[PDB]
């Protein structure tokens, strides 16, 4: 129980790519948060970042706004999305402001997770231990119509502001990853004590 920090630290190392982990550690230390003392926060950041990459790498985009999968596009001579999560927050805000300026659109008040070059919209991603619909409308309160929302729960429910933002195979990649993580956390008795994103 007091070893829950070390158990979560170890879990993180065994369940995520080194690249994912290093970014999350860096963002916590920007908030002057010790990952060793706030392991729940480190886990949540890792999952969030991994989901954003799972959404962004799924398709690529050409000059005229046509999308391709990685296989379809290879050799033709960018990722459909700019990933704003995963970098220091000062650099993140530079990116969001540049993207808005480049495209002649408003700059959202809050920091986005992704930017979709196809629709020219910012996207917020959320992962909840609770009901996705609840979290969705909680974010809507603050965000309004400034961004699209993609909310996923560990319990396989989800809520999307734009249903065409994910095919059923992309949804299945995200949700299956979350289901697998919850099963493992449950087996380690780490699930009940995890503080989800929706309570931060
Ligand atoms: Mn964010
Ligand atoms: Mn988010």
Numbering used by the authors: -6 to 70, 74 to 196
Give sentences from the paper.
In addition, a structure of the influenza B domain with the I38T mutation was determined without bound compound at 1.8 Å resolution. For the FluB I38T mutant in the absence of ligand, the threonine side-chain changes rotamer. The methyl-group is now in the position of the CG2 of the isoleucine and the hydroxyl group is only able to make one hydrogen bond with the carbonyl oxygen of Met34. Furthermore, in the unbound form, Met34 is orientated into the pocket and also has to change rotamer to accommodate the ligand in which case it packs against the heterocyclic fluorines of the tail-group. The results show a 10-fold reduced activity of the I38T mutant endonuclease in vitro for both FluA and FluB (black triangles). That Met34 is also important for substrate RNA binding could explain why, in the case of FluB, the I38T mutation has little impact on viral fitness.
